[PDB]
Amino acid sequence: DITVHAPLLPIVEELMKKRRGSRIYKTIKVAGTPLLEVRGQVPVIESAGFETDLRLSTNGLGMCQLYFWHKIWRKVPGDVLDKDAFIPKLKPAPIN
C-alpha cells in the first residue's frame, strides 16, 4: 500500500517496473487530499530496501507499507530441474 502525492505517480510506477515481478492493481484517489493510495504487489525476495528507494525517489512525498496477511504464494519462473541454466556470479540472475 503506497501513499504518494498524485503528480508523482510516474516515479512510483517506474519503481514498480524496475523491481522484478511487482505490479500495480488499483489506484485510489484519496478524496479531499493531494494523495493517491496505490495498491500493488512485490515479491518478498525483491522487497529489500523498497521503502528506502520509494521514499528517496519521491523526495519524502511518498511512503509505503508492506504486509503478508493475504497469504499469496506464486510460482517462480523457470524450471527447478533445468540443469544447465545460466546463473551469474554477482549480477542478479535472468528470469528463466
Partner: protein, 453 residues
C-alpha cells in the same frame, strides 16, 4: 458583366471542395497554400459555408483540429474570414443547441475552443458559450470546452474561472449523475491536478510561424440569426482593385583538435576498458563516431605490433550501443574497399589480426566478410595478404572445426564459390591452400571435379 463575377465565384466554389474535404493534420499547410490559388479574398464566404455544412453534417470528430488550424492560417493574412467565421460558428452552435443535436454541438465547440487556444477568437465568445451551457445545465459540453481550453481562461479571466470550477465541484460533490458524465468530471479534475495543459489536441506547434493571427469578438445574445444563404454569389464592387490586392498578397505569401583529443585519450589509458570508458564519457555525436573509429584504426597501425588494447576498446564500444557497431562495420568496409591500397605489409598484418580478432569473438558478424570477392582481378595483392592474416587469426582463435562450421553457416559465396566458373573456384582453392587452410577447400574442390567432368 455580372455572369463573369458569378463564374469567378463558382470556380472557387468547385475548386475548394477537394481542398476542404481532404483535411487531415498531414495537409493543413498544403490545403492552406492551395486555397490561395484562387481569389478567396473576394470569394470569402465560400469557405465559411463549407465549414458550417462540414461541422453540421459530416461527423469529423478527430478532424476538427485541422479545420481550426486552417482558419487560423487564413486569419494570419486575411482576417475578414476570422471576423465572419466567429459569427458563423456561434450561430451554428445556438441553432444546433436548439435542435438538441449534441454531436454537432460537440463538433462546433471542439472548433471554437481550439480557435481560442489559438489567438483567433476573443474570450467573450467562449464566455457567451459557457453562459448558454450553464443556463441549460448541458454539463457534458462544459467538460469538453473546459478540458480543451480551460487554462487559457485561468490566465485571461481567473476571477470567473474560479466560479466555473466551484460550480463543477459542487455538481460532482452533491448531485446524482450518469456514470459517463461522472467519469468525465473526474478525469477533468485529474487534468487540472496533474498537467492542466494536457488538453492540447490543438496543434500549438504552429504558433511561432502563425504569429500574425489576431482575435475577433462577437456577442450572440443579441437577436441575430444565421444568414445561411450568404454562401451563394453576391456582386462585388472594386473587383479589379481587390483582385490586384489578392495577387500581391499571394505573391507575398507563396577537425585536427578532435583527432588530437581522441589520440590523447588512447595514449593516457592503461587498459582498453579505461580507454573505452574515457571515450564513452565524451558523448561523441553520431556523425563523428566514424571518424573516432578511423582514429582508433590509424593509431593502432602506428604501433610496432597488434595489441589486445585495441581489441578490448573496440569490443566495449561495439557492445555499448548499436551506433558504434554500425560505425565499426562501415569502417571495416571502408578499410577493405578504399584504404588498404596504400598500407604496407606489416600494417596489413596488424589490420588482419585486429579485424580477425573482432570477427572471432563475433563482435563483427561473419556476414561482413561478404565484401571480399576473391578473384585475381576482383582482388588486389594487398587485399589478398590482408585476407591471409585475417583468416590466420581466425584459425588461431577458433580452430579449423569451429571456423569451418561458421564459414558453412555464413554463405560467403564471394570467396567460397560453388556455382561459379571453374577458373574462379580454382583460384579460391589455390589461395586458401597457399595460406595453409587447405582443409577448408575440400567441398569446393570436390565440386570442381564435378563441373570439370
Amino acid at each position: 458583366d455580372i455572369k463573369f463575377q458569378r463564374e469567378n465565384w463558382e470556380m472557387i466554389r468547385s475548386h475548394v471542395s477537394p481542398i476542404i474535404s481532404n483535411l487531415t493534420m498531414d495537409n493543413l499547410q498544403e490545403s492552406h497554400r492551395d486555397l490561395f490559388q484562387v481569389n478567396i479574398l473576394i470569394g470569402r464566404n465560400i469557405i465559411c459555408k463549407n465549414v458550417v455544412d462540414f461541422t453540421l453534417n459530416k461527423q469529423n470528430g478527430r478532424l476538427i483540429p485541422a479545420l481550426s488550424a486552417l482558419i487560423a492560417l487564413l486569419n494570419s493574412d486575411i482576417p475578414d474570414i476570422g471576423e465572419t467565421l466567429a459569427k458563423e460558428l456561434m450561430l451554428m452552435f445556438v441553432q444546433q443547441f436548439n435542435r438538441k443535436d449534441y454531436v454537432s454541438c460537440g463538433n462546433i465547440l471542439q472548433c471554437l475552443s481550439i480557435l481560442f487556444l489559438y489567438d483567433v477568437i476573443h474570450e467573450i465568445v467562449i464566455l457567451q458559450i459557457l453562459l448558454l451551457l450553464l443556463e441549460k445545465n448541458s454539463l457534458r459540453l462544459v467538460i469538453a470546452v473546459m478540458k480543451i481550453c480551460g487554462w487559457k481562461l485561468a490566465l485571461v479571466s481567473k476571477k470567473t474561472h474560479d466560479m466555473i470550477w466551484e460550480k463543477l465541484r459542487y455538481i460532482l460533490q452533491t448531485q446524482e449523475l450518469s456514470s459517463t458524465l461522472r467519469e468525465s468530471l473526474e478525469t477533468l479534475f485529474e487534468i487540472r491536478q496533474k498537467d492542466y495543459k494536457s488538453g492540447s489536441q490543438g496543434l500549438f506547434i504552429l504558433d511561432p510561424t502563425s504569429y500574425t493571427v489576431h482575435t475577433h469578438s462577437y456577442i450572440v445574445s443579441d437577436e441575430d440569426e444565421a444568414n445561411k444563404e450568404l454562401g451563394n454569389f453576391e456582386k462585388c464592387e472594386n473587383f479589379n482593385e481587390l483582385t490586384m490586392a489578392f495577387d500581391t498578397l499571394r505573391q507575398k505569401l507563396l577537425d585536427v583538435e578532435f583527432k588530437k583529443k581522441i589520440y590523447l585519450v588512447l595514449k593516457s589509458s592503461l587498459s582498453g576498458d579505461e580507454a573505452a570508458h574515457k571515450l564513452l564519457k565524451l558523448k561523441i555525436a553520431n556523425n563523428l563516431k566514424k571518424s573516432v573509429v578511423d582514429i582508433i584504426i590509424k593509431s593502432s597501425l602506428q604501433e610496432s605490433t597488434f595489441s589486445k588494447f585495441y581489441s578490448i576498446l573496440s569490443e566495449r564500444m561495439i557492445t555499448f550501443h548499436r551506433s558504434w557497431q554500425t560505425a565499426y562495420n562501415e569502417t571495416f568496409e571502408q578499410n577493405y574497399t578504399q584504404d588498404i591500397e596504400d598500407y604496407e605489409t606489416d600494417q596489413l598484418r596488424i589490420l588482419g589480426k585486429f579485424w580477425g580478432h573482432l570477427i572471432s569473438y563475433e563482435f563483427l558478424p561473419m556476414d561482413c566478410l561478404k565484401i571480399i570477392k576473391l578473384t585475381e582481378e576482383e582482388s588486389c595483392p594487398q587485399g589478398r595478404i590482408f585476407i591471409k592474416f585475417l583468416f590466420q587469426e581466425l584459425v588461431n582463435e577458433l580452430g579449423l572445426d569451429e571456423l569451418q562450421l561458421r564459414l558453412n553457416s555464413s554463405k560467403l559465396d564471394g570467396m567460397f564459390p560453388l556455382e561459379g566458373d571453374a577458373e574462379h573456384i580454382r583460384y579460391s582453392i589455390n589461395f586458401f591452400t597457399a595460406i595453409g587452410l587447405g582443409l577448408l577447400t575440400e567441398d569446393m574442390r570436390s565440386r570442381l571435379t564435378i563441373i570439370q567432368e
